[PDB]
RNA sequence: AUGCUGAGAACUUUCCAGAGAUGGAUUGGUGCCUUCGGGAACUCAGACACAGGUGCUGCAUGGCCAGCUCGUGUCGUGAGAUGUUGGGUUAAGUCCCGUAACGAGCGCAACCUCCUUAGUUACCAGCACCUCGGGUGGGCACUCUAAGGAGACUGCCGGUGACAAACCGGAGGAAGGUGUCAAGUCAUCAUGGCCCUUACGGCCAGGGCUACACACGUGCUACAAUGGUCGGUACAAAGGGUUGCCAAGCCGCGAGGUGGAGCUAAUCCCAUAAAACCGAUCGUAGUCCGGAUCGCAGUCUGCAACUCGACUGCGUGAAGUCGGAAUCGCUAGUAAUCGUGAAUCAGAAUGUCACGGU
């Protein structure tokens, strides 16, 4: 599975701090509160770290990206 | 008259012979014998009593038994030859020991045993 | 534990707290007759609106002791107890046979 | 393996004789566990033996076998409504209690099992009474019982298959009927659990 | 120790005719199909004369002449070097060693049609110069050093 | 008529109550259609200590009866619907 | 889990600082028994006390091949021994006869083909008919899977042996002799010496458990030749089935989401299938069995698939060559290669798989 049958991404309160940003300036990270939360596709540039306990990492992003979780910016088993 | 029963039984059957007598004419299960079956050798093993018998000029043989597997009730072929002639007469009685191919064997797949593999097929120890 | 065999009990009565808009938003998104407009208003479901409204996270256990491993469907009870209940007589028709 | 399981049938009865459909068959199986719960901590006199939980036509059937009614019946029905109240409320369905009579009571396993964890936690002797237990219940009718005690026995580390044994009980055979009644209680010092198998005659 | 056991051979074949070939079907069945076997079992059979001027009953019976041995290979103690023990042996010891290691040489060969490839050693026991023969001479003249040994320290 | 009970011993004392006594009242009831053992088989564990090579074997079983009413006015159906269960047998009826 | 006191009983608390709970605007309600006194449940709440042991600890706190012990009696100064040795036999402390021994409990041994009445709705042994798939009466006899049942022998004759346990042989008849090993849990019910005692009574937790650098408990699968790639055969097919199982699919090379024959299943959804004929071109290969990071990307749970998932379509990137040093281990139904359908009512539970037809 995972496949298109899911094609848009409208998710209302996962939302309210990333649409509404638009006009305002980049100058702040958009901190996220899950390993699950993502954001839109047409917006494409963001920074999102990933979300578990104790301390952030480097989150690069580019415009190609159409595919999975946001797992390979910090690993899933990062290599203590 | 001779609108007998007849019954033989691999893996839980319940038969029918249409018996009456004739000149040695076999069929099975709404089929002949070179008609369902061929591609075998188990169609005259049944031959075996049949013409120690020597009924092979005198009845008309048409048992119908269904269920098992390819060569399953190819061991029911096995049974049904005598039994509805038997009850016919007393000639071939005590003649028939010598073959001895009437009893359900019991030492097919009986209840399934836990801890082992299979019946009493042993698993890996050490 | 005291805080916890009270706390996710409680899952009967607020998983289907709301129980009449849970059956009202999720039968027609499986039938394609929504527009090509209509992606967004099918989807102001569950969520916000307080999360205890899906199901992925409740578990079938024992009444009296709680142990969730060895529960059947034809039960309410678990493997420490088909030992000591048919034999007391508290389950019907469970007999030795082959 | 289980001894008991096998006598569901031609020798004795099932106690939860009750159907509800194939999935309908756990809706009557959430009120088969609170009943016995009450009769263990608080109703020890007139101690219980076997309960019959049934469902008859439109309530339940719940009957006590106890020994003792003068202490539970009083002047009419006064506490009938006081086991048809505290019972049936966390129960789902309501039972009408009928009382039978049980007159010679020594012969039921369990009438005995629940009569020595009253008697072990003051200090009464551990071994002139396990013996005089079955030595006064053995005049007229059963032929012989026999006691494994396998436990405390005053000392700790004990694990001494005690040979309390007074006559003829074969445990193995279904005609010749096997009681088992472990009664569990606490007493001042040492889980000791009261196991009891009071043999009566055969058919 | 006893034997409890009682030998019951069942030999009935349906076609051929035999009298020792019938019941065989056992390395024939390699744990599969029978309809897979039928033209190996007795198809075989068909298949060995088809070059040949004879009954294949003919060459099949006289493989107790070559390929037999006559002493046996069992290992026994006295006190000290482990004995084995040449006899005259009973027909169902040699002729054992007559039947199913001749066929047991038919992966080596690994030729055209499944049928002749277990088949196709038979014919050789006319003269007796086949596989099975070069083994049973070895034995003979291995039981030089040992035929003494039957009754003393045997 | 068929019911919904539970095994050999309470289907077969339950049903002797139903054909006499609707063969009383003048009617004719046809007699019982068999059903063998429902055959499932089913696996738990009894060890204390957490083992594979342990299992077991129980069942339970569920017998039902055909029958059929030819001229239906029985008073034995509805009446003695009451009267065909003891402690747990729950009679389904119907009119055939 | 708590005793005392609360506005408003409880609900709604959907919506907003939540990118992430709720306190609250809480969008409305006064409820509830009537000596018209009183009373009580709760979203949260300010005092006192605690509940939590989620480190330690199986050492004063686990109970579910066959032989071992008691009681009585003796001999022995006693510990202890006889019973239980022996002789003939036994799967056997199974016995027969001897024998200062006699009776016991335990393990062992045993315990878990014959049938009245039968088939409302399968279908063709009675038969008309049939699309010869049986629409259907009739299938109770030439039957459709049986609830429960005389059930299998020391039964018998004869040669051995003390005639005796047994052991050898024949019946009938297409069936005849079977109480043990100071070790995993003060932790699924239990229970200690110290502890957290503004606390593991606070929880929306600001992520840092696989550098390949090995031996291996190794234990399906082949030895390239029966030769290298499919959509086909006389062909599986019912139950649980009132928050479920999810047609012929229109979709298909192979996806049977809208469809839905079956909605309480002699019904059916995975419903399709069995290693057979002579299977093709060519007739015996570490390779035209070979794809490990570079499937990108395709209207199905549905508010949660932004550099990773089934869908194997085979353009590619290999290590499978008689198992020898030595050892898993096979005396009879056995060494041995056709699969699981169903929840507290949402369907990827793999070495011990409902039937391995050999």
């Known amino acids: 599975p995972r496949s298109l049958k899911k094609g848009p991404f409208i998710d209302l309160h996962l939302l309210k701090k990333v649409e509404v940003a638009v006009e305002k300036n980049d100058r702040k990270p958009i901190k996220t509160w899950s390993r699950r939360s993502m954001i839109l596709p047409h917006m494409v540039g963001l920074t999102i770290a990933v979300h578990n306990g104790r301390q952030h990492v480097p989150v690069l992003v580019n415009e190609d990206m159409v595919g999975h979780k946001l797992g390979e910016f910090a690993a899933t088993r990062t290599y203590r | 008259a001779t609108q007998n029963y007849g019954t033989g039984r691999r893996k839980t059957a319940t038969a029918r012979v249409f018996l009456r007598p004739g000149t040695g004419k076999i069929s099975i299960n709404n089929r002949g014998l070179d008609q369902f079956f061929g591609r075998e050798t188990a169609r005259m093993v049944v031959r075996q009593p049949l013409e120690l018998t020597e009924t092979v000029e005198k009845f008309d043989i048409f048992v119908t038994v269904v269920g098992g597997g390819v060569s399953g009730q190819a061991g029911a072929i096995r049974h049904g030859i005598t039994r509805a002639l038997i009850e016919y007469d007393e000639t071939l009685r005590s003649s028939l020991r010598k073959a001895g191919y009437v009893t359900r064997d019991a030492r097919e797949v009986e209840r399934k045993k836990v801890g082992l593999r299979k019946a009493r097929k042993r698993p890996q120890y050490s | 534990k005291e805080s916890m065999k009270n706390r996710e009990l409680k899952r009967q009565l607020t998983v289907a707290k709301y129980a009449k808009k849970r059956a009202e938003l999720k039968a027609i998104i499986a039938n394609p007759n929504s527009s090509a407009e209509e992606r967004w208003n099918a989807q102001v479901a569950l969520q916000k609106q307080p999360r205890d409204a899906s199901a992925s996270r409740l578990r079938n256990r024992c009444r009296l002791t709680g142990r969730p491993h060895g529960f059947y469907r034809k039960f309410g009870l678990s493997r420490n107890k088909l030992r000591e209940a048919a034999m007391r007589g508290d389950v019907p028709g469970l007999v030795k046979a082959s | 393996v289980h001894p008991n399981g096998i006598r569901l049938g031609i020798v004795k009865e099932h106690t939860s004789v009750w159907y509800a459909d194939r999935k309908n068959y756990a809706d009557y199986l959430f009120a088969d566990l609170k009943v016995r719960e009450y009769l263990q901590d608080k109703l020890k006199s007139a101690s219980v033996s076997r309960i019959d939980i049934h469902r008859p036509a439109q309530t339940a059937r719940i009957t006590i076998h106890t020994a003792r009614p003068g202490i539970v019946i009083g002047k009419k029905g006064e506490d009938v409504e006081k086991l048809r109240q505290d019972l049936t409320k966390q129960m789902g369905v309501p039972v009408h209690i009928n009382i039978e009579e049980i007159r010679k009571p020594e012969l039921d396993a369990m009438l005995v099992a629940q009569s020595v964890a009253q008697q072990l936690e003051r200090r009464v002797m551990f071994r002139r009474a396990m013996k005089r237990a079955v030595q006064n219940a053995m005049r007229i009718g059963a032929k012989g019982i026999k006691i494994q005690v396998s436990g405390r026995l005053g000392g700790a580390e004990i694990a001494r298959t005690e040979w309390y044994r007074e006559g003829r009980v074969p445990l193995h055979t279904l005609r010749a009927d096997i009681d088992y009644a472990t009664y569990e209680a606490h007493t001042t010092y040492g889980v000791i659990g009261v196991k009891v198998w009071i043999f009566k005659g055969e058919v | 120790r006893r034997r409890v056991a009682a030998k019951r051979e069942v030999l009935a074949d349906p076609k051929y005719g035999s009298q020792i070939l019938a019941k065989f079907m056992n390395h024939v069945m390699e744990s599969g199909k029978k309809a897979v076997a039928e033209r190996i079992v007795y198809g075989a059979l068909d298949k060995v004369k088809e070059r040949g001027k004879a009954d294949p009953l003919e060459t099949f019976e006289k493989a107790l002449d070559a390929i037999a041995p006559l002493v046996e290979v069992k290992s026994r103690r006295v006190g000290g070097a482990t004995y084995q023990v040449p006899v005259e042996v009973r027909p169902s010891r040699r002729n054992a060693l007559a039947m199913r290691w001749l066929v047991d040489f038919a992966r080596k060969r690994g030729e055209k049609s499944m049928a002749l490839r277990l088949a196709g050693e038979l014919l050789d026991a006319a003269e007796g110069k086949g596989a099975a023969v070069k083994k049973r001479e070895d034995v003979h003249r291995m039981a030089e050093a040992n035929k003494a040994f039957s009754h003393y320290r045997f | ?96």
């Not at chain 6, 299992?55 to 569920?62: H, M, N, S, V, W």
């Not at chain 6, 729950?90 to 009119?95: D, F, G, R, Y």
């Open chain 6, 1 to 96: 008529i068929r019911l919904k009970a539970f095994d050999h011993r309470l289907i077969d004392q339950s049903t002797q109550e139903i054909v006499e006594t609707a063969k009383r009242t003048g009617a004719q009831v046809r007699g019982p259609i068999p059903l063998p053992t429902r055959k499932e088989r089913f696996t738990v564990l009894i060890s204390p200590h957490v083992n594979k090579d342990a299992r077991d074997q129980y069942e339970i079983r569920t017998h039902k009866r055909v029958l059929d009413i030819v001229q239906p006015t029985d008073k034995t159906v509805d009446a003695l619907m009451k009267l065909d269960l003891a402690a747990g047998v729950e009679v389904q009826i119907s009119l055939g």
